[PDB]
Scaffold this active site. Sequence first.
Site, PDB file in Angstrom:
ATOM      1  CG  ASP A  32      -1.948   0.959   1.057  1.00 56.86           C
ATOM      2  OD1 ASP A  32      -2.464   1.127   0.047  1.00 56.86           O
ATOM      3  OD2 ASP A  32      -2.847   1.453   2.019  1.00 56.86           O
TER       4      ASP A  32
ATOM      5  CE  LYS B 220      -3.193   4.947   0.552  1.00 55.38           C
ATOM      6  NZ  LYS B 220      -4.574   5.561   0.133  1.00 55.38           N
TER       7      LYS B 220
ATOM      8  CG  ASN C 126      -0.268   4.878   3.005  1.00 54.23           C
ATOM      9  OD1 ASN C 126      -0.970   5.495   3.435  1.00 54.23           O
ATOM     10  ND2 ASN C 126      -0.123   3.741   2.350  1.00 54.23           N
TER      11      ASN C 126
HETATM   12  C1  LIG Z   1       0.435  12.436  10.749  1.00 53.78           C
HETATM   13  C2  LIG Z   1       0.927  11.315  11.783  1.00 53.78           C
HETATM   14  N1  LIG Z   1       1.792  11.836  12.300  1.00 53.78           N
HETATM   15  N2  LIG Z   1       2.388  10.361  13.131  1.00 53.78           N
HETATM   16  C3  LIG Z   1       1.542   9.489  12.760  1.00 53.78           C
HETATM   17  C4  LIG Z   1       0.786  10.204  11.642  1.00 53.78           C
HETATM   18  C5  LIG Z   1      -0.102   9.362  10.973  1.00 53.78           C
HETATM   19  C6  LIG Z   1      -1.337   9.686  10.243  1.00 53.78           C
HETATM   20  C7  LIG Z   1      -1.917   8.770   9.425  1.00 53.78           C
HETATM   21  C8  LIG Z   1      -1.735   7.340   9.981  1.00 53.78           C
HETATM   22  S1  LIG Z   1      -0.510   7.470  10.965  1.00 53.78           S
HETATM   23  C9  LIG Z   1      -2.611   6.468   9.552  1.00 53.78           C
HETATM   24  O1  LIG Z   1      -2.572   5.170  10.055  1.00 53.78           O
HETATM   25  N3  LIG Z   1      -3.498   6.421   8.598  1.00 53.78           N
HETATM   26  C10 LIG Z   1      -3.677   7.607   7.952  1.00 53.78           C
HETATM   27  C11 LIG Z   1      -5.274   8.113   7.770  1.00 53.78           C
HETATM   28  C12 LIG Z   1      -5.485   9.171   6.842  1.00 53.78           C
HETATM   29  C13 LIG Z   1      -4.851   8.961   5.333  1.00 53.78           C
HETATM   30  O2  LIG Z   1      -5.616   7.830   4.983  1.00 53.78           O
HETATM   31  C14 LIG Z   1      -4.944   9.852   4.357  1.00 53.78           C
HETATM   32  C15 LIG Z   1      -5.174   9.695   3.063  1.00 53.78           C
HETATM   33  C16 LIG Z   1      -5.465  10.510   1.757  1.00 53.78           C
HETATM   34  C17 LIG Z   1      -5.110  11.923   2.460  1.00 53.78           C
HETATM   35  F1  LIG Z   1      -5.149  12.845   1.424  1.00 53.78           F
HETATM   36  C18 LIG Z   1      -4.910  12.018   3.729  1.00 53.78           C
HETATM   37  C19 LIG Z   1      -4.832  11.396   4.791  1.00 53.78           C
HETATM   38  C20 LIG Z   1      -3.377   8.703   5.440  1.00 53.78           C
HETATM   39  C21 LIG Z   1      -3.169   7.658   6.582  1.00 53.78           C
HETATM   40  N4  LIG Z   1      -3.122   8.800   8.703  1.00 53.78           N
END
Ligand SMILES: Cc1[nH]ncc1-c1cc2c(s1)C(=O)N[C@]1(CC[C@](O)(c3ccc(F)cc3)CC1)N2
Lengths: 382, 387
Positions: B190, B192, B195
């Site tokens: 996954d 991208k 991530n």
């Molecule tokens: C910021 C941070 N600091 N320490 C950990 C994190 C994490 C952040 C996320 C984490 S850890 C996670 O596990 N999932 C996501 C859920 C939202 C997501 O799917 C997304 C998709 C498309 C977008 F345009 C915007 C955001 C991305 C992954 N976010």
Amino acid sequence: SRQRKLEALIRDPRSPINVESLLDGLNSLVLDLDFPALRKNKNIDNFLNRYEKIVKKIRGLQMKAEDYDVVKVIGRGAFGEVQLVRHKASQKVYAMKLLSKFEMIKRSDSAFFWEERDIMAFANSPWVVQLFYAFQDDRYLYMVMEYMPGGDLVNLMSNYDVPEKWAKFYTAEVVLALDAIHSMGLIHRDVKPDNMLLDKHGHLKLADFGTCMKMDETGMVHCDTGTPDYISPEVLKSQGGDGYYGRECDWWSVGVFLYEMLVGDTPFYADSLVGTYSKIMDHKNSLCFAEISKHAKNLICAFLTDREVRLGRNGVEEIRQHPFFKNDQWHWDNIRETAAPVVPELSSDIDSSNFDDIEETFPIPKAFVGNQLPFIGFTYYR
Amino acid sequence: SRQRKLEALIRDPRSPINVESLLDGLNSLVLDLDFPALRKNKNIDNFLNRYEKIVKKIRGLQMKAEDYDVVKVIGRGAFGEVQLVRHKASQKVYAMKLLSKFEMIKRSDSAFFWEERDIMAFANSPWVVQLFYAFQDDRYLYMVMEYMPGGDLVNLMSNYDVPEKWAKFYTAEVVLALDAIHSMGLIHRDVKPDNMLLDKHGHLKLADFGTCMKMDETGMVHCDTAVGTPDYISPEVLKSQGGDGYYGRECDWWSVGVFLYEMLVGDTPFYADSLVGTYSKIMDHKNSLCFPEDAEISKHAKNLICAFLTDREVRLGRNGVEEIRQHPFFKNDQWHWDNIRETAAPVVPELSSDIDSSNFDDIEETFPIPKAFVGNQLPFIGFTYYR
Ligand SMILES: Cc1[nH]ncc1-c1cc2c(s1)C(=O)N[C@]1(CC[C@](O)(c3ccc(F)cc3)CC1)N2
Ligand SMILES: Cc1[nH]ncc1-c1cc2c(s1)C(=O)N[C@]1(CC[C@](O)(c3ccc(F)cc3)CC1)N2
């Protein structure tokens, strides 16, 4: 603080959330979830795949009934038998009591053992038979206790014509043993020669704690739960719906024991449950004697009266200073380290000549029944 | 031959039967049994009356969600949100991902996080976002990770026009991050820009491990589900939906190819108006993949993309991570592969404070009482982790 408050609770082998108990909480969850019917459940199947592996391993490296040689069966209780056993590795001889899980689930009788375990494990008295290991499997509960090769007083009393001076000793060691039970805030309820075992050197230890209750803030108990011979009037009466009773009910039992030992028959003997029960209730008119001294006759009568005036209601001290317990060869401070009336003759570590001879599954569930849940936390190592 | 063998199993933090997991075991049993319908059962009542009191007191000591101030919602995943939080007592800032227990159970998908946890809790790589705490309650699953104030790469690609010099850097870091993921025995599936998060200093970390599979003893996986985001899926993972699927790490190097194409062209290579159209373009990737006439891209860059975007058998990186490193595209004067992470980043984030979230856009149901035993909390026994 974090995991300091929490670490303390885990360490305490008196606390219900010690390591061994947490492992029971996993095993009994696996044992009650692992049936094909319930396995159709997504959640129950996710869990059992992830844990069944490691759970089976654990089962391997903790005490099993296979870790013991079964020398011979020395007693048979209401649920399982008591075996004379020898641990294979250490080669040490113990007495192992089995309790049937199924025969306990099939009855309003599946909590009694908790007191039987705690007393024998943690009493730390010379008067209490001592529990080393408590373990279980899907079928049974096990308690591994120090073996008492001397037999019980029911066996001694039939084998020996007991004279007065012998009764002075035996009654006294029961009095003390009972006081030790009381000083743990417990009444024994059912005191009798069967629960009175003799050790290597011929001295008393109490054993069958199945019917124990813990006293209230006040000292009484207020709930209903055998056979009457050695049971106090207030205890029988209170089987029909509440009414408190206290530590004095054990002293009644003692009087019955001193009578049987001096006379030969129980003071309210009758060839029926009804007969003995009826005789006990009318203890005012039913108790009569003979060849007993006035001092010995008197102690019996001071015990065999309703709880209000019964000797030992005011304290264990009343009992001690009684004229009957006056002899030469023992004081209450050293009775255990004196010579017993009958020192048993013992050939070896597996001799059981003071004991006699004697010669089941769960139904596969459809829904969650939780048969093992009552036994979570029973496992104990010294 | 002793119970000291067992003693070790309990202490081992990454053992299925560590003390936290054993306590989760006792807790999620009390939770799934304490219902009046269930309590009609002698056994279940005998148990609860003896354990329910002490279990409650333990729950008191366990890390609550009350322990945290919620500064701002910075993201929302499939099963819940990611909150920027400050732990009350310590006063340290963390990112906290919530996972709805209900939505997870209701959608039969409630096993994906186990890997997600282990990677973050035990990776110890500067490339993996790191987990400090992992607690739960009756309703939710909680993951406390180090906050990444820099934002994600999707954000960076829509605020800046990425020149190939930047693309060199980011791709390189993604490559090394993935190699670290692989060297832990896991394929990502996954990868991208979503991530791909950026630390305080503008450097990369990988984030969403929900889709991770651990390779078998031969570096291969047997999967019969097409998992991951539709735009970054590799032809092998896609095909694997039907019949015996069989693939190794190479699928992650596909994603890197697509990632680079998006960063330079400004669009995903196999974009289509439907999901069902994107899948088809991926399947026919020989004919569907082509660069537009107007987008100007170095002959080295196009080479790297096309080396990545091919069948697994001939895909770049199939014969080790090395053939990626030496690729002409990654020639530069600003970073070597030994140090990269300690060079200046192409975009260093401007943070005013420890709770600055200017690189994140702002935004903006439970179980039924059961009849018999259901075990809703059983899939979550053993989640709990502490540093
Ligand atoms: C910021 C941070 N600091 N320490 C950990 C994190 C994490 C952040 C996320 C984490 S850890 C996670 O596990 N999932 C996501 C859920 C939202 C997501 O799917 C997304 C998709 C498309 C977008 F345009 C915007 C955001 C991305 C992954 N976010
Ligand atoms: C021998 C030993 N050594 N270390 C402990 C023991 C225990 C022995 C028993 C123990 S421990 C026990 O808990 N229960 C019993 C079950 C059999 C019982 O009911 C019996 C037997 C014969 C009777 F004529 C009347 C009654 C007595 C109590 N036995």
